[PDB]
Design a protein around this ligand. Structure first.
Ligand SMILES: *[C@@H]1O[C@H](CO)[C@@H](O[C@@H]2O[C@H](CO)[C@@H](O)[C@H](O)[C@H]2NC(C)=O)[C@H](O)[C@H]1NC(C)=O
Ligand SMILES: [Cu+2]
Lengths: 214, 36
């Protein structure tokens, strides 16, 4: 098979600026390369065919270039409507193959997070599981470190986290970090804290709760 | 495909594309080296 290598996997560009995407193939694919746009939930959207020719309804904003084995997609003046995942595709050789995709992030000013912590409910304790959730709301950039402290002891490997896409109006992120303990293990400790580190905070923010605080 | 010499076949769209579209490109298709 042929490999399409896209770079960078991510790109932080503010509206009105230019974005230049790179797509490099492992074999020569002449000029038989297309580009696609895909937004969360939606299906792909064809942008370019034959390296540089646009589909119907594609603004001149998008401009494709390249030939042989190195290909490029350039967006002249970004609009909010354009931030999404961009894939390149070769159809010179079967099977058709896509790349990993480049994700356009919307650059904006720093926003510090608001932190909240949620003890496990009495309904979940009956079941036999304890989930301690720590919420980071509205913040930018994405990079953020959220550490857990049980009885002021630093934890490791017992917490999963997921983040939302950039907001439609804020362009900020919201992250959740869930500590998953068992009811037995959750009652061996008392103080449960959540330490947050972000560029928008001069020093880390910590929110905690004691088992039985309420 | 069996397109005219004034065209080239794009296998993504499975159709005959006029060579004129890419004549003004940095490198028209290797089969459109005449129309331009
Ligand atoms: C499937 O469709 C193709 C393409 O239309 C058919 O090939 C055509 O056959 C007719 C009659 O034999 C010709 O007039 C066309 O010029 C042919 N096209 C090409 C590109 O060669 C093909 O016969 C069809 N297959 C079937 C009916 O089994
Ligand atoms: Cu929010």
């Amino acid at each position: 098979e042929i490999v399409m290598t896209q770079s960078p996997a991510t790109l932080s560009v503010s509206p009105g600026e230019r974005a230049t995407l790179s797509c490099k193939a492992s074999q020569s694919v002449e000029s038989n390369v297309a580009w696609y746009q895909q937004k969360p939930g939606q299906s792909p959207r064809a942008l370019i065919y034959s390296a540089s020719l646009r589909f119907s309804g594609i603004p001149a904003r998008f401009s494709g270039s390249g030939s042989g084995t190195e290909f490029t997609l350039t967006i002249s003046s970004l609009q909010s409507e354009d931030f999404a995942v961009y894939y390149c595709q070769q159809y010179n050789n079967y099977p058709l193959t896509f790349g990993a995709g480049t994700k356009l992030e919307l650059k904006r000013t720093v926003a510090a997070p608001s932190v909240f912590i949620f003890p496990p409910s009495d309904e979940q304790l009956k079941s036999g599981t304890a989930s301690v959730v720590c919420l980071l709301n509205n913040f930018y950039p994405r990079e953020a470190k959220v550490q857990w402290k049980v009885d002021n002891a630093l934890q490791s490997g017992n917490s999963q986290e997921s983040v939302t896409e950039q907001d439609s109006k804020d362009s900020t992120y919201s992250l959740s970090s869930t500590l998953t303990l068992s009811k037995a293990d959750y009652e061996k400790h008392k103080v449960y804290a959540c330490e947050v580190t972000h560029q928008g905070l001069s020093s880390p923010v910590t929110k905690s709760f004691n088992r039985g605080e309420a | 495909g069996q397109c005219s010499q004034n065209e080239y076949f794009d296998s993504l769209l499975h159709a005959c594309i006029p060579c004129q579209l890419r004549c003004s490109s940095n490198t028209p298709p290797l089969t459109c080296q005449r129309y331009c």
